[PDB]
Design a protein around this ligand. Structure first.
Ligand SMILES: *[C@@H]1O[C@H](CO[C@@H]2O[C@@H](C)[C@@H](O)[C@@H](O)[C@@H]2O)[C@@H](O[C@@H]2O[C@H](CO)[C@@H](O)[C@H](O)[C@H]2NC(C)=O)[C@H](O)[C@H]1NC(C)=O
Ligand SMILES: *[C@@H]1O[C@H](CO[C@@H]2O[C@@H](C)[C@@H](O)[C@@H](O)[C@@H]2O)[C@@H](O[C@@H]2O[C@H](CO)[C@@H](O)[C@H](O)[C@H]2NC(C)=O)[C@H](O)[C@H]1NC(C)=O
Ligand SMILES: CC(=O)N[C@@H]1[C@@H](O)[C@H](O)[C@@H](CO)O[C@H]1O
Lengths: 531, 527
């Protein structure tokens, strides 16, 4: 009649899950659990309302809809881009979460990993195949949770000060999911006193913002930030710029026929979701890569100050964090607008294309700041060698957007009481479809963290499956103990700046997360932008 | 009497002296007056040609050194005393010296003209390290050296005034160059093959003659050693020159530019010298009070502006630096440094040294320097900070001005040869942490190691003979070769290392560091 392992009661009511086959054994999965009221119609742009209790049994047996988002069409049918595209229908009815737990249910409380996907705050879904939590749960006997959150205008369009579109509601969907975990994860065997957030890119920036927001900080105990930080130049926006982009989006879709914020949002709520998605990229002030229209707003509520300020002034005793980057963070973003770049050739750019790419990769800085960038990333013994120029532009975008914000986040946390571990992911997957010059691109450590190479229908090498199991062990040991060890992985500190390389070879300790370059981005360039 | 030692120039008759070298004799004519003594009412005025004389001027010994500060940092120490005046000081100092082979050449012989350095505040043609006897015997050239007014006597300027016009020390040099054109053939020299060479402020002087049309017709080739006219220390603007001259007057009790200069001319020369260093606007190393002024006359624009707009086709220049240009200047004001300790400074002292080594720049510019010269994996290492500050000072003041001058000239038609002098003399008295300090290639260029009464090794004498051949090859043909030394170009940026080993070709005169000083920092300062 019924399998008791697949029946769980939470606060809202009863749920029914599925038994998942994994290479290593069965796993219980509860996919598509509603945690908020559907943010439809009058509740578009509003903070999430908690899901009201239900009678009967909710079938949590498949992934729910993807939150409405732009769908990438740059390389149609290409695996390297389609793997990030929605694998479910688009809907504003999208605030559901997923729980994976061992089969049978754990008898004693079990550490919990909570995943927050990335995608520039304009895309992403917990349902993508590369976020499949079944392998982590089977291999390491943790409970894994992932949630959807609203993206694009639906999650982050802000008319600051207004009550109809206050902004950051996509972050509040994440927080509501975290509150759901605290109240309900024990029913699945999870330990609410041992919750570790991990996320990638905008997911990592989200994790950092929960660290810096007191109402979120009490909902978890450790953090993992992969290829992202809340202090990234793309991750937040000012109140004035948020209002200008919101107002321009309205104007582009016929609203109003600025003004009263209530009349404005009300007009926006009458437009079909796809109409807003279609005009989203037009509100960006300039021709850029690695910039996104609707992102978290620094408005005094969710973030009482900028992530930079909160980081430098924070007390982080009692916190363990694991951070890292891939070896070639910038290359992926260059084929999305940088002159002379394509995945289908070598992208051997000229000096003129390099200088033009600097303004696209570092938008909105004075000519002087752009000149400092070029001075720094030019080899003045080979100022016009195309291969060096291509690699230098990739470093510019990667350093400025990922590596140096990550490094600043690691150094300040370590100096102010936190226990920090840092990595650089240096393995290029045998299955990677991107060209060779891109190296190890952004986002391609995730599949190894989630143990995807263990999927039988894949054709990863046996070496890569060992590698994946090593990384899952590191991540789960961190979740359990705040220490990935059990060759050792030394903590990161502001002085020694030690990190480990993650590849098929054993751990190798190195110093400096591009210390020379990040001194420019983190120490000097802010002083230049102040005068 | 020996006929070889009697020469008639346009002003009258001279009697020289025969000197010994290990390779044979040489004729020397020392202390030839080329200008009327710039005394009394003539102080601060451009030089006037020496009036003809009757009888025979005695040209057998060096004449007086122009009035200058005497360094007292390490009294009795050979490293500093070798640069101090070795004759009595006098304002009557406008004399020059000629060395020629013995017997005097009967065919026109290429001419080398030496302009000494000393920050435009010191120096003398009579110093032992500038002895021309070895070059003349070994390489069969005529060598000329002149004294020129330094300090306030040479470069005090009230711009626009006819009583203190400025740059008269440079005009002293030009007058000697005109004297060379009119009289050097009487010594066997060829006035159509004149090569200027100088070091530090002498090299800056050479560059300024390259950039001044009235001087350009008086020589044909140029050598600039560890100096350039575009250095941040080599010129001053009119406003700052007037302020420094006015501050000097107040410091000596004076007093209308006419009234100001008249009172200044009442003061003993040593009184002006005693207050010279105190007109500088800030504490600093590698800055000097009275330097050439850019007032539209001798220089119609800044040396950088003239270098960028110049057609230099038909010019050959030889330029270079020593391996550690900055180390010597640090013991004259940088906190934590001394020749008697390892000078292992702290980070705080490094940051303090940056403000004195790069004076008169905004805090933002100083931060840019600190960013570029910090190893952010070893930000506090004492030995690394000592080198970094030595690099800051050497790059800012010598290497990058030299590299900018080389690249611009080469890109605009002239043939450049560049070197880095990398041999530390066995006789060097400075501590080992200073490496190859500023100025210690000169003794090898002049062949001083060939002096038997000195302690140079057999290899160092061969090395000195190599360098004399390169320098003389350049003076004869505009090409030091005869392991080839390739020309310096803005793209390939090739230079050679000069030491006991054979020539080695390398690329880039600290290209990464000099891109910052040369390309970025000017834009920063303009904002
Ligand atoms: C390398 O490719 C880029 C991008 O090209 C597109 O992709 C190529 C693989 C090829 O299919 C092209 O025909 C495509 O247009 C080239 O940059 C483009 O160049 C074209 C023609 O000059 C121009 O119209 C586009 O605007 C350019 N796009 C971008 C993003 O720069 C580049 O010229 C190629 N370089 C080579 C051939 O080495
Ligand atoms: C190295 O020496 C300098 C200068 O000190 C002078 O020279 C020494 C060789 C010795 O003769 C001292 O008596 C001299 O005072 C040191 O810098 C000075 O340090 C003193 C304090 O000891 C301080 O009062 C001065 O202001 C400093 N002056 C400068 C130029 O910085 C330096 O600390 C010594 N470093 C070592 C010991 O390695
Ligand atoms: C603040 C303001 O004046 N703007 C008005 C508001 O007063 C009114 O309640 C609302 C009704 O939709 O329309 C808008």
């Amino acid at each position: 009649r019924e399998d008791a392992e697949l029946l769980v009661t939470v606060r809202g009511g009863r749920l029914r899950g599925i038994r998942l086959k994994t290479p290593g054994g069965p796993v219980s999965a509860f996919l598509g659990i509603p945690f908020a009221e559907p943010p439809m119609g009058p509740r578009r742009f509003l903070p999430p309302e908690p899901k009201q209790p239900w009678s009967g049994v909710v079938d949590a047996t498949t992934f729910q809809s993807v939150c409405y988002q732009y769908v990438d069409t740059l390389y149609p049918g290409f695996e390297g881009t389609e793997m990030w595209n929605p694998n479910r229908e688009l809907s504003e009815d999208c605030l559901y979460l997923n729980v994976w737990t061992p089969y049978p249910r754990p008898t004693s409380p079990t550490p919990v990993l909570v995943w927050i996907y990335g995608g520039g705050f304009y895309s992403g879904a917990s349902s993508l195949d590369v976020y499949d939590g079944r392998f982590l749960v089977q291999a390491e006997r943790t409970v894994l949770v992932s949630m959807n959150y609203r993206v694009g205008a639906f999650g982050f369009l802000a008319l600051p000060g207004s009550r109809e579109a206050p902004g950051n509601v996509g972050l509040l969907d994440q927080r509501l999911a975290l509150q759901w975990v605290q109240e309900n994860v024990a029913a699945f065997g999870g330990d609410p006193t041992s919750v570790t957030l991990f996320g990638e890119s905008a997911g990592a920036a989200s994790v950092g913002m929960h660290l810096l927001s007191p109402p979120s900080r009490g909902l978890f105990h450790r953090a993992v930030l992969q290829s992202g930080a809340p202090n990234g130049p793309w991750a937040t926006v000012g109140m004035g710029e948020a209002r200008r982009r919101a107002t321009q989006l309205a104007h582009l879709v016929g609203c109003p026929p600025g003004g009263n914020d209530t009349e404005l949002v009300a007009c926006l709520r009458t437009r079909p979701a796809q109409v807003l998605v279609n005009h989203e990229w037009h509100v960006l002030p300039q021709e850029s890569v690695f910039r996104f229209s609707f992102v978290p707003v620094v408005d005094g509520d969710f973030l009482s100050d900028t992530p930079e300020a909160l980081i430098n002034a924070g007390d982080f005793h009692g916190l363990q964090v694991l951070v890292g980057v891939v070896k070639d963070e910038g290359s992926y973003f260059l084929v999305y607008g940088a002159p002379g770049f394509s995945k289908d050739n070598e992208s051997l750019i000229s000096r003129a294309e390099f200088l033009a790419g600097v303004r696209v990769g570092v938008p909105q800085v004075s000519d002087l700041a752009a000149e400092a960038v070029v001075l720094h990333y030019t080899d003045w013994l080979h100022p016009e060698d195309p291969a060096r120029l291509r690699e230098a532009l990739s470093d510019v975008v990667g350093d400025h957007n990922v590596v140096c914000p990550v490094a600043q986040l690691a150094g300040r946390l370590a100096a102010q009481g936190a226990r920090v571990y840092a990595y650089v992911f240096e393995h290029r997957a045998s299955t990677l479809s991107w060209p060779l010059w891109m190296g190890v691109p952004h986002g391609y450590e995730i599949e190894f963290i989630f143990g995807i190479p263990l999927d039988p229908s894949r054709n990863y090498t046996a070496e890569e499956k060992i590698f994946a199991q090593r990384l899952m062990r590191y991540w789960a040991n961190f979740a359990r103990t705040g220490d990935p060890n059990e060759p050792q992985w030394p903590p990161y500190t502001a002085g020694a700046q030690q990190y480990v390389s993650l590849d098929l070879r054993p751990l190798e300790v190195r110093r400096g997360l591009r210390a020379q370059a990040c001194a420019f981005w983190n120490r000097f360039l802010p002083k230049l932008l102040s005068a």
